[PDB]
């Protein structure tokens, strides 16, 4: 069972927030999910991860424990691209991709 990444398409304007929802909760509950931006030539570019890998892309967990809000604060026009949320079981599972548009 892989993670989810909704909505499939997210059209926001230039300046406001943009938030996706990565729904994932495995059979072990010992997981660390990443938030990568896929390049036009299939070369992921990690943005953030939960728990916050300390070393504008927010990652907050909801009370249900299965949904995670991945937010792009003050979405710039260059942020339009492909995004996905991976999941690592302590093994990796990539969620379905999704598009992000910024008018």
């Amino acid at each position, epitope marked *: 069972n892989p993670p989810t990444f909704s909505p499939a398409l997210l059209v926001v304007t230039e300046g406001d927030n943009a938030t996706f929802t990565c729904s994932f909760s495995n059979t072990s509950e010992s997981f660390v999910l*990443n938030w*990568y931006r896929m390049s036009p030539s*299939n070369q*992921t570019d*990690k943005l953030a*991860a939960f728990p916050e*890998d300390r*070393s504008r*892309f927010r990652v907050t967990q909801l009370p249900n424990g299965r949904d995670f809000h991945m937010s792009v604060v003050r979405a710039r026009r260059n942020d339009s691209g492909t995004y996905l949320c991976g999941a690592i079981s302590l093994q990796i599972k990539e969620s379905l991709r999704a598009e992000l548009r910024v008018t």
Partner: antibody
Amino acid sequence: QVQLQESGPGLVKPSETLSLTCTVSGFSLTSYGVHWIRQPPGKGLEWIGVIYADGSTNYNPSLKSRVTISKDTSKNQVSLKLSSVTAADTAVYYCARAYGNYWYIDVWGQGTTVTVSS
Amino acid sequence: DIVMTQSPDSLAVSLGERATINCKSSESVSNDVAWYQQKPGQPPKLLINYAFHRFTGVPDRFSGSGYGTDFTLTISSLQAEDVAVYYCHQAYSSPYTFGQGTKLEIKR
């Protein structure tokens, strides 16, 4: 394409300062970090330092006070200076691009062997 | 300075067989670890980024794993063009140290 072309002198006299350069082509030099790496004869890879898009650098504690990494944005070049050179600096220096918000070294340079000798 | 220690200094599995390489860090470099392949004379080549995702144009036979201080690089079926040195690299904190390389050679 995405490249990194290194160029420097073949020889370096002991106690002098070694000057290197990494001419870039393909990507916005003000949007990617360039990392210098050393490869001594018959040995592995050793990190020398980085230069981010803002213009700040991080150096190897063992190499600090001798390394200097700058960049000429109007020329798409990254410079590497090594003062008070000894016979230990003889190696193959590599410049490499850094990709991602949580960076990783993707593209590498061609390499430039430096022989510290008289 | 985090110490990247590759365990199999020299690996010589046969042709077409599985071949894994371990690279353990002395501290938590949790998922900013990249793998590189280098041949004599040529510069390094990247294979795995973030320790799981494989780079573009990289054969499918390559796989990566690890999240703490336990990283691995796996080759499903070893090919003749795979003979090279494989270096791991940490990007967690300075001095972003590397491993020491694992020489991968073919037995025939």
